């Protein structure tokens, strides 16, 4: 089947960066491979259909004449009802595999759009910001370790409340380039639009699938028998039956099961995309408490104001997923004992200096 | 068959950590691959079914008419019993492969939940704790070897009973960061809930399988013949039999064997998951005797009090499985001659110093 | 099928250079693999045709005589209409796979032409220009860093407005070979012609496909029945039917669907190639503002005059796609905070010196 | 067939240790792969069965009626003997492949039990003991080479009979940790039980196979013809034969040959497992003569007393198989010229010092 | 089919040298793989022939008798025309795949001849000449850089017109071995004959293909019906038809299409080989202007006189294709600004010294 090769080529799982969130990957997998799995199950493996149509031809007919009768009604699915002559067609039965392949191809467009229009710029931003952030370790322990060593040599105001301004507001404790980079990227609105487009396309395609199933299916759903006509052409001047009644659709059960599964999977999938869309509607301040003390990480939490729909929100969203790679997968994560500014001033008297690598 | 590919993709057997216990791996294997094996055996290989239904049509019928009769009763499995007209359906015979595939997919959900919601945090905790514990070797032999060297130079109270406090309660013999990490992690209850959910989902799915087999099977279990109707539509105005009696289900034996195997395997599997759940209901103190003397390992055995349902219990459970990697796969394991505090005070007069690497 | 192997061999995705733009790659993929996919779908997988023709032979005929009748009409598709004796042929039905393969082979010619007649010279140009451009980093920060260090030691005209000529017009700040290379290559018109030929060939082939579909198809499009003759030779002296009426074409639906898909895909593809052609009709000056200050990059923006149809335009087009490799994927890209010469004179007081690697 | 994949996955042939004896590997191979080979031969390759049942239906019957008769008797194997109405079933003919697969799966349980419950502890023991034993080379040639160098400088009692106590009972010639390890593991009885269970399970499964073949086979062994009934249901009110006599089992020869091969292979296999069990009933003292002189190897031969059913016996059994890896695959093995304590005292005057590496 | 394996084995695309020109590779590909592709298309994939002959046997005949009639006429293709008894044979229909395979094998002979009789000597010459030529870089910039450094220190005749003879005619500026090698190789005529043979063989084989198609085809081209005889032997004394008229050739369309494609492809291919032959009829002096100034490259352009049919012509032809490998893929190619000896004397005042690697 073409489903196996289609799943092999498309939907197949810099140099270290994570440019896709896990939930987006799960959504893409279950939205692209599901129609391929349905197509593979419906027209291969278990249910060897043989012919999808059976005909009750007269016993006078030969084998080849019966084959002609049953071969010319599969490609001309028309119920010649006696109710004038409203010849209802049953084309979805013939078109189902085409529709499944088309849906599988359609669901892959937002992935390509994201990969082509948003990955490179986001990768550049992530690389620059990570390279600037990894310099923040030896700037609070290799620079502010002469804070407690001096603390024991004096008492109160001029040893721990008048030195946090002469040292924090110092040249080696400042990141002027990164602050400007973040301020400029907060104004931008380019990469935030690709996210919204990528989610809205999936919503629109789900709506189109619902419309297709509700308009074309759900009408020929309990119909398994139709009467055709053979003498509608050059065979009209022949002595045989004008209505070859009772052609039976053999694969109606597969039709119904595929339709129901297609409805259920996308109904389950709908709220996840809405949650993904709403992820960008708020400023995430879960760990802002520990960020505002570190030198470089203070700028990340400083610029959380106004409308949260910006490029900075997307950059932060993709940065928290990469902040656990190998080097920030350290003291930063180990700083879980510092979440319990009066008490906060004295609580860090042990942890920061004891978190050193050696 | 799709069973081979499904087993190839799913259920297919950081950088050194063991994040899954062997019993969980065995349970997952025998709970996911068993329905796939049943599906592969039932509808391939040995028993080439051909058609799952046979019909005794009149000899007047042609070959194509007999094919029509036997093709229109497989998709319309309805026993037209004379007992009004309670047309009992035999749909499980047609739905069995669907059900097996659905069960195989359903049993894979807890694995994904564990891999997505609990693996990263547990990996971080394990990495930090292992890195902190590996420093405990050169802190009891490279720090307390001037304990027996001094012991021979003096006698009793001030050489082996008044020095175990000036040296044990010393700066280089203390781990203040790890103690706080463990104290804070004992309060947490986040990673303990994923374990319980992962086991309870398997229990619930087993219960659902029992309900499905007891309600839909076990009724059509000894029934192998049914009488159908063909003149229930456009063929009603025709001169042939109005009850095509004795349609025989050819694959009844496979049905029965698959049902019995499905019952037996999960009945055997049930108590293992309960044992896995109850593993977390107690404080495991098997080797606490040897832990309480080592500097860093004393903290692990100190915090064993109160309710055992914590994050510390899960972390300890996963730590004992990794404590035999390559470096703790040493003296710690070799300390099996120290399990036989009066006698304990003097028993270690040989082993600890003789366990040195050179 | 041959479609799978054809897609495997052709259309299968120095040492670092990008010699093909992403849009060209997408166009080539969707223009070459689409007929192969149509051929694979139409004559394999889902629709097992069997025989593409059915015949209603008399019941007196044997099985072998009926096979003879239906086999001698597939290779002699001629409608013996009674309207003199205008025997209309239906050869496109027989020729469709041949035509699809021919179209797939035809669409691959411009790719070969570009790969054989334009890749090596462009690669040489790109290598030389990139090697010359990578020397521009340590010529504005390692050469003009004694510009602000001197700026604080003096005031105005002779420290920042009379030194930008004694240093910019200096031997170490000049690239005389690269300027001559660019001036000579602006006059050339060789590699610019291959681009135009590569696009025009695709346009011409699309026009030919439209002509083929409009002349040969669209006439036999709703015709599914034709009456043939068998007694047109050595069988003329025999007692059987002189017009074997009602031969039916079984695969008419596949014919129609393939024709419609072929029309739609190329109609969608047409404007992209026109956009690619018009990309070369203008001087792209998006980032010329930041180019004119850097030493080596000033020459690239200086030579933007006159007719834009040159070799320099193509070289620049392929250079902007490679300017983000690993080393220019640096300060150059990070210089996004310098896009907001009065203000421009003083705005760069921070960024250029702060963009240093250490 | 599933036999090929089953043999590929299971039964498929630290970092240097040998944790399985060759005889155990041979037994496992010939006990697991033999039923798989029988299944592959019986139901594939050479003997293409087609249908395992043939029926002599009346000539009045149609093709489909004959197919119905022969299809409804394979799933209802019941001999309607006239001798009341003892309908003997012939279900083993239908169940043979299931039984072969079940036996192949059953024979794999002891392998899993050994791999899961005994391999890690034995690996730890072997690693520690090998690391301790590899230190014994430079302790009898690099420590007792000042024994013959001094021997030529003196005469008799105080040069070769009064120095073998001041040097053998010396600190550098003692292994106090390994002696305690061996003394403690001689008391243990944990890993010795897994060996016995692994062998007893194979014996029990062989007994079960014998019971199965003697009870269910050997009764339907020379029976190839049975008379069935079709009018035992909804077909009872029909005019045709009430006893469709002479259904013939086509594959009786394969049945007999498979049964005989299954009997013979396991009958041949039985004594090997008994020999493996009895291997642990004695203290192996084949090379104890040369062990008792080497410093570290003296402890291995010292602790051979009392009941031989211990953990030390299993450890020694697995140690002799690994004592020829690369480094003990040396002088130890080359010491075959020292097997011919009066003569023994003087015989080693050449070999030990001449066995040096340079 | 054997076509796939034949294309896999033959026609499948030192250590750096290019011993085949691109046009020769294209010609070989399109001349060898084209008959293989035609054979694959004609007798596989799309057009499943079944039987290439159909017979209109009398209805009295059985199925086996009709099979006998149609099986004994495929191997005895003889038209028993009534026009004496000129039994025309139609053997090309039966021989077409043999002929295609033979043509594919025949077209591969010149490739083998070139690979066996000309590749090694040409490789040796190319290696020696390239190794001698790569020494020419540090002999005009590392040897004649004291030409402009001295030029500024003097004026005219004895600084730039009397020093170009004392330095150019110097020992370190001479290549006496390479000149003798080229002078000797210009006299040789061995490797030039293999080129001519390789092209003439292809021309002769194309002529043979034309003769074969014009003599054996083109006569049985519109003939699709022939009358055979069966009573031409032991069946002559039987009561049935003496002329089994109207045997029909089913695959006539494939015959015609294959013949036309074979004609067209080789007609298109003919002029390319003539162009390849005429490539050696002239001295290529496109870049001789820049060659005559470089020390070692002067000898290459000096020896261009007399008849151009030599070994030197072939060596130069294969040398220009390799002159862009990695090291001559440098200044030599970059010297494109020096093509615009009065002006030539002064034009090189910039480029040669500025083309240095650092």
UniProtKB/Swiss-Prot annotation, chains A, B, C, D, E:
Keywords on this record?
A: Cell junction, Cell membrane, Endoplasmic reticulum, Gap junction, Glycoprotein, Ion channel, Ion transport, Membrane, Transmembrane, Transmembrane helix, Transport
Reaction(s) catalysed (UniProt annotation): Ca(2+)(in) = Ca(2+)(out); ATP(in) = ATP(out)
Provide the membrane topology annotation.
Answer: Multi-pass membrane protein
Glycosylation site list: 60
Q: Which residues lie on this side of the membrane: Cytoplasmic?
A: 1-28, 121-201, 275-358
Biological process (GO) annotations?
cell-cell signaling; monoatomic cation transport; osteoblast differentiation; positive regulation of interleukin-1 production
For this UniProt entry, what's an example GO CC term? Answer: plasma membrane
Its localization reads:
Cell membrane; Cell junction, Gap junction; Endoplasmic reticulum membrane
Transmembrane regions: 29-49, 100-120, 202-222, 254-274
What molecular functions are annotated in GO for this chain?
A: calcium channel activity; gap junction hemi-channel activity; structural molecule activity; wide pore channel activity
**Ranges facing Extracellular side:** 50-99, 223-253
Q: Give the disulfide map.
A: none
- InterPro entries associated with the record: Innexin (IPR000990), Pannexin (IPR039099)
Source organism superkingdom: Eukaryota
Q: What protein family is recorded?
A: Belongs to the pannexin family.
Q: How does it assemble?
A: Homoheptameric.
User: What's this protein's function?
Assistant: Regulator of osteoblast differentiation by functionning as a Ca(2+) channel in the endoplasmic reticulum which regulates calmodulin (CaM) pathways. Allows ATP release into the extracellular space and activation or purinergic receptors.
Q: What is this protein called?
A: Pannexin-3
Organism, per UniProt? Homo sapiens
Question: In the record, what lineage is assigned to the organism producing the protein?
Answer: Eukaryota, Metazoa, Chordata, Craniata, Vertebrata
């Amino acid at each position: 089947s073409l489903a196996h090769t289609a799943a092999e080529y498309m939907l197949s799982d810099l140099k270290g960066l994570r440019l896709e969130l896990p939930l987006d990957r799960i959504v893409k997998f279950v939205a692209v491979g599901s129609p391929l799995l349905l197509m593979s199950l419906a027209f291969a493996q278990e249910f060897s259909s043989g012919s999808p149509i059976s005909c009750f031809s007269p016993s006078n007919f030969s084998i080849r004449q019966a084959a002609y009768v049953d071969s010319s009604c599969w490609d001309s699915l028309l119920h010649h009802k006696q109710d004038q002559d409203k010849m209802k067609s049953l084309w979805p039965h013939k078109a189902l595999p085409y529709s499944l392949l088309a849906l599988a191809l359609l669901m892959y467009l937002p992935v390509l759009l994201w990969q082509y229009a948003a990955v490179p710029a986001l990768s550049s931003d992530l690389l620059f910001i990570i390279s600037e952030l990894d310099k923040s370790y030896n700037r609070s322990i290799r620079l502010v370790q002469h804070m407690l060593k001096i603390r024991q040599k004096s008492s109160d105001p001029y040893v721990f409340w008048n030195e946090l301004e002469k040292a924090r507001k110092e040249r080696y404790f400042e990141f002027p380039l990164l602050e400007r980079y973040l301020a400029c990227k907060q104004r931008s609105h380019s990469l935030v639009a690709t996210y919204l487009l990528r989610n809205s396309l999936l919503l629109i395609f789900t709506s189109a699938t619902y419309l297709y199933l509700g308009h074309f299916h759900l009408d020929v759903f309990f119909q398994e028998e139709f009467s055709c006509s053979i003498k509608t052409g050059l065979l009209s001047d022949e002595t045989h039956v004008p209505n070859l009644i009772t052609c039976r659709l053999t694969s109606l059960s597969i039709f119904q099961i595929v339709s129901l599964s297609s409805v259920a999977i996308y109904t389950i999938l709908v709220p996840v995309i809405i949650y993904n869309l709403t992820r960008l509607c708020r400023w995430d301040k879960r760990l802002l408490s520990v960020y505002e003390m570190l030198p470089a990480f203070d700028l990340l939490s400083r610029k959380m104001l106004g409308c949260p729909i910006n490029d900075l929100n997307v950059i932060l969203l993709f940065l928290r997923a990469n902040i656990s790679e190998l080097i920030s997968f350290s003291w930063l994560s180990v700083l879980c004992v510092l979440k319990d500014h009066n008490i906060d001033t004295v609580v860090d008297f042990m942890t920061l200096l004891a978190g050193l690598e050696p």
